[PDB]
């Protein structure tokens, strides 16, 4: 028993991290087969940052301008292109540690693991959700750009995130591995504010099922609700609407615990209206929204990779 | 910026996990050089568990009785011994992925990363503290025994924990890699209760410094306290006494922020006596005690491994 914010094992991704330097800027790249992927802002200087012209900046760069190191091994760059906000550096050596992989664009509300890197060396690993406003609440300092987000399914690494920037509010924004930003953000030091965030309702319900599976059941009340009546309460507390698709995704947890999803909704309604009155759930004094239903089933059933 | 419960990258440890089966029980082992380390209760059956006689049980086992697999590769066992509560299985193949490593016995209040494994395959990674009562608050199911705890310092893996059991209260207990239990626990299904737990005061102070470094400063008050006056308040709230050694360990964070440790103690005193009145600190509605001062400096300075 027990329930923790668990990251995926990072070993498959650690083998792909390199250091990319162009001029004085050094940041991380992802080395898969004979390609290194990194944020295109590696080619900016201090006072390009307001509105860089990335195409003009790249045209002035040759292959030798890019210094790529995998540990203490130099990788020779033999070609470069730009795809949206990522650079693709073709190198003369394929990564012998390239895992089975996929590039995925994740939906808001989904979770992934972040491998935070500096100078191409891993610092740590933690679990993040793509917030409804397309930001993540991470831990990133100068030098962390090109750190990636991923999920593992059996033997396959699904890369979903590459780190580019921190908004003046302290939340984080980045791209998929095709270099399209999540949300309405640009790789410029400009005015750009995150949308109002909302709480991921299906995740909160998943975590309450996790609480029940682990023996924390004090919040279960005796009532039921309709989906429409629940959603009127969700709206008032800045929660996302619960859809029939979400009800269906919670079906396995409902079955395991014997608690109908609309009965769990009535318990959540009471928590939102009344608070927790000093009580914790799975050691938290707040309602947790960064566990998906699939995260809960994985952790509560002991799903392994490969 | 930002502050997350960050685990160490797990790749160095993932390469050492194997499956050990003796009879019907399958669990995890740690494969370093030509030795596999695993909990000795792999040799028990269902109705040995109340008071197993491990020496008599092992005497009945030969090398072929132990089936060890590293992925889909069988490792042939060529010798076995027992050291305290761990088995050491000598194998015919040295692990080619053996990292630089050390066996350490950690002190209560220190943190480590856990790589949760089933059938010798990694499931996930999370950060734990050794509680003052020598338990950990983990996430472990049947099949997780032999999962290990570790810290990484540069290139060196310090193994500190091997998982053996869950107490009837839902907290977790295990050994160092010499097979000595942390705390007064035994590898028997007997009556054994954890001591009353206490909150790790130096860690709470470290996390309040982390909050200040990341811009969450609402709780800083204008007062100071003496160490003796602070400790009278700590005792009442079931916090550990703060020692001069702890004051000294908090010196780097004090310097960075300009807040004297006894000034931070006066802010913590007010939080304990008055509560947070619905306010969060680094997204938490409770005082967090599973970050060491060294964890905070590592995360806030971007320390990498190798
Ligand atoms: C990565 C750049 N790199 O590693 O070279 C960096 C991401 C960091 C900065 C601190 N927190 C992060 O998440 N990205 C940028 O610096 C980015 C560059 C633009 C061309 C997109 N700008 C940015 O994030 O500005 C905000 C900021 C900078 C420095 C400290 C705090 C916030
Ligand atoms: C590991 C055993 N294994 O993998 O084969 C297991 C640890 C688990 C059980 C569920 N939670 C854990 O942390 N350890 C034991 O089963 C242990 C064996 C004794 C000989 C020490 N006994 C034990 O933990 O009893 C409590 C328990 C068992 C099963 C479910 C919940 C609690």
For chain B, the first-to-last Cα distance in angstroms comes to 23
A152, A305 contact by CB (below 8 A): yes
**Nearest ligand by distance to the CA of A2:** 2
Q: Per CATH, is A1-14+100-197 categorized as 2.40.10.10?
A: yes
Name A232's Cβ contacts closer than 8 Å, sequence gap at least 6.
Answer: none
CA–CA distances in Å: residue A58 to residues A44, A54, A147, A153 = 9, 6, 22, 36
- The domain made up of A15-99 has a fold known as Thrombin, subunit H (2.40.10)
Q: What one-character-per-residue DSSP string does chain B give?
A: -----PBPP-HHHHTTEEEEEETTEEEEEEEETTEEEEEGGGG--TTSSSS--HHHHHHT--GGGEEEEETTEEE-EEEEEEETTEEEEEESS--TTPPSEEE--PPTT-EEEEEEEETTEEEEEEEEE--TTS-B-----TT-TT-EEEEEETTEEEEEEEEEEE-TTS-EEEE-TTSPBSSS--SSSS---PPPP-B-HHHHHHHHHHHHHTT--TT--S----HHHHHHHHHHTTBPPPPHHHHHHTHHHHHHHT--HHHHHHHHHHHHHH--TT--BTTBSS------HHHHHHHHHT----
Of the candidates B213, B204, B214, B215, the residue with the CA atom closest to the CA atom of residue B267? B204
Could you tell me the distance, in angstroms and rounded to a whole number, from the CA of residue A130 to the centre of ligand 2? Answer: 35
Could you tell me the distance, in angstroms and rounded to a whole number, from the CA of residue A164 to the centre of ligand 1? Answer: 7
Of the candidates A122, A126, A101, A112, the residue with the CA atom closest to the CA atom of residue A18? A122
Query: Same fold for the domain at A1-14+100-197 and the one at A15-99?
Result: yes
Residue B169 near chain A (CB below 8 Å): no
Which one of A299, A304, A305 would you mutate to disrupt binding with B, by most B Cβ within 10 Å of its Cβ?
A304
Q: What would the two tokens of residue A108 be?
A: 């808001």
B65, B76 contact by CB (below 8 A): no
A157, A164 contact by CB (below 8 A): no
- Write phi, then psi, for A236 (nearest 5 degrees): -65, -30
Of the candidates A231, A214, A202, the residue with the CA atom closest to the CA atom of residue A280? A214
* HSE-CB for A72 with a 13 A CA cutoff: 1
Which one of A3, A5, A7, A73 would you mutate to disrupt binding with B, by most B Cβ within 10 Å of its Cβ?
A7
What is the C-alpha to C-alpha distance for residues A79 and A58, in angstroms, rounded to an integer?
12
| Entry field: residues in chain A | 306
Q: Report how far Cα A106 is from the mean position of its chain's Cα atoms.
A: 8
**A202: part of which helix (H) or strand (E)?**
helix A201-213
Could you tell me the distance, in angstroms and rounded to a whole number, from the CA of residue A38 to the centre of ligand 2? Answer: 44
Breaks in chain A follow which residues, C to N over 2.5 Å?
none
Query: What residues flank ligand 2, with Cβ below 6 Å?
Result: B 25, 27, 41, 44, 49, 140-145, 164-166, 172, 187, 189
Helix A201-213 / helix A293-301 crossing angle, nearest 10 deg: 20
Minimal Cβ distance to A121: which of B12, B124, B305: B305
Q: Is the CB of A40 under 6 A from ligand 1?
A: no
Q: Report how far Cα A87 is from the mean position of its chain's Cα atoms.
A: 20
Which one of A3, A5, A11, A12 would you mutate to disrupt binding with B, by most B Cβ within 10 Å of its Cβ?
A11
1.10.1840.10, 3.60.20.10, 3.40.640.10, 2.40.30.60: which CATH number matches B198-301?
A: 1.10.1840.10
CA–CA distances in Å: residue B112 to residues B106, B133, B238, B251, B276 = 9, 16, 23, 22, 28
What is the C-alpha to C-alpha distance for residues A295 and B241, in angstroms, rounded to an integer?
38
What is the C-alpha to C-alpha distance for residues A252 and A254, in angstroms, rounded to an integer?
5
Is A11 in Cβ contact with B122 (below 8 Å)?
Answer: yes
Is B305 in Cβ contact with A8 (below 8 Å)?
Answer: no
Of the candidates A114, A108, A151, the residue with the CA atom closest to the CA atom of residue A131? A108
Nearest CA to ligand 2 atom 26: B166
Q: What would the two tokens of residue B279 be?
A: 């306010």
- Write phi, then psi, for B221 (nearest 5 degrees): -105, -175
Exposure string for B182-209, b = 16+ CB within 10 A, e = fewer:
bbebebbeeeeebeebbbbbbbbbbbbb
**Data resolution in angstroms:** 1.6
Q: What would the two tokens of residue B223 be?
A: 């007062």
Name B243's Cβ contacts closer than 8 Å, sequence gap at least 6.
Answer: none
What is the C-alpha to C-alpha distance for residues A141 and B300, in angstroms, rounded to an integer?
8
Exposure string for A4-15, b = 16+ CB within 10 A, e = fewer:
bbbbbbbbbbbe
Is A128 noted as a catalytic residue in this protein? no
Is A15 in Cβ contact with B14 (below 8 Å)?
Answer: no
- Write phi, then psi, for A92 (nearest 5 degrees): -85, -10
Q: How was this structure determined?
A: X-ray
Q: Show residues of chain A in contact with B214, CB under 8 Å.
A: 170
Q: Show residues of chain A in contact with B12, CB under 8 Å.
A: 11
Could you tell me the distance, in angstroms and rounded to a whole number, from the CA of residue A154 to the centre of ligand 1? Answer: 33
Q: Is the CB of A44 under 6 A from ligand 1?
A: yes
Residues 140-159 of B with CB under 8 A from A: 140-144
Exposure string for A174-211, b = 16+ CB within 10 A, e = fewer:
bbbbebebbbebebbeeeeebeebbbbbbbbbbbbbbb
Could you tell me the distance, in angstroms and rounded to a whole number, from the CA of residue B117 to the centre of ligand 1? Answer: 36
A184, A41 contact by CB (below 8 A): no
Nearest CA to ligand 2 atom 31: B166
Is the CA virtual torsion B64, B68, B72, B73 positive or negative?
negative
Q: Show residues of chain B in contact with A172, CB under 8 Å.
A: 2
Of the candidates B67, B79, B36, B63, the residue with the CA atom closest to the CA atom of residue B177? B36
Nearest CA to ligand 2 atom 5: B143
What is the C-alpha to C-alpha distance for residues A175 and B119, in angstroms, rounded to an integer?
35
Chain A and chain B share a number of CB contacts under 8 A equal to 159
The DSSP letter of residue A15 is: T
| Domains of chain B, residue spans | 1-14+100-197, 15-99, 198-301
What is the C-alpha to C-alpha distance for residues B273 and B261, in angstroms, rounded to an integer?
18
A22, A61 contact by CB (below 8 A): yes
Q: What would the two tokens of residue B270 be?
A: 């007010």
Name B192's Cβ contacts closer than 8 Å, sequence gap at least 6.
Answer: B167, B184, B185, B186
Is B85 noted as a catalytic residue in this protein? no
Q: What would the two tokens of residue A126 be?
A: 């933690």
| Catalytic residue, candidates A16, A38, A145, A265 | A145
Is A11 in Cβ contact with B123 (below 8 Å)?
Answer: no
Residue B137 near chain A (CB below 8 Å): yes
């Amino acid at each position: 028993s027990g329930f923790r914010k668990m990251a995926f094992p990072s070993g498959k991704v650690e083998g792909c991290m390199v250091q990319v330097t162009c001029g004085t800027t050094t940041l991380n790249g992802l080395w898969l087969d004979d390609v290194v992927y990194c944020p295109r802002h590696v080619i900016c200087t201090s006072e390009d940052m307001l509105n860089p012209n990335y195409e003009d900046l790249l045209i002035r760069k040759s292959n030798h301008n890019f210094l790529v190191q995998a540990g203490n091994v130099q990788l020779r760059v033999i070609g470069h292109s730009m795809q949206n906000c990522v650079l693709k550096l073709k190198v003369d050596t394929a990564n012998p540690k390239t895992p089975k992989y996929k590039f995925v664009r994740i939906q808001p509300g989904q979770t992934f693991s972040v491998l935070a890197c500096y100078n191409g060396s891993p610092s740590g690993v933690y679990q993040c959700a793509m917030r409804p406003n397309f930001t993540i609440k991470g831990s990133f300092l100068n030098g962390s750009c090109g750190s990636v987000g991923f999920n593992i399914d059996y033997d396959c690494v699904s890369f979903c995130y590459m780190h580019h920037m921190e908004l003046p509010t302290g939340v984080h924004a980045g791209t998929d591995l095709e270099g399209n930003f999540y949300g309405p953000f640009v790789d410029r030091q400009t005015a750009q504010a995150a949308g109002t965030d909302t709480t991921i309702t299906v995740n909160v319900l998943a975590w309450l099922y996790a609480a029940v599976i682990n023996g924390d059941r004090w919040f279960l009340n005796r009532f039921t609700t309709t989906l429409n009546d629940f959603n009127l309460v969700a709206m008032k507390y800045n929660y996302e609407p619960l859809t029939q698709d979400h009800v269906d995704i919670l079906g396995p947890l409902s079955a395991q615990t014997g608690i109908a999803v609309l009965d769990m909704c009535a318990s959540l309604k009471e928590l939102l209206q009344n608070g927790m009155n000093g009580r914790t759930i799975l050691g938290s004094a707040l309602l947790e929204d960064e566990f998906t239903p699939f995260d809960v089933v994985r952790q509560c059933s002991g799903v392994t990779f490969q």
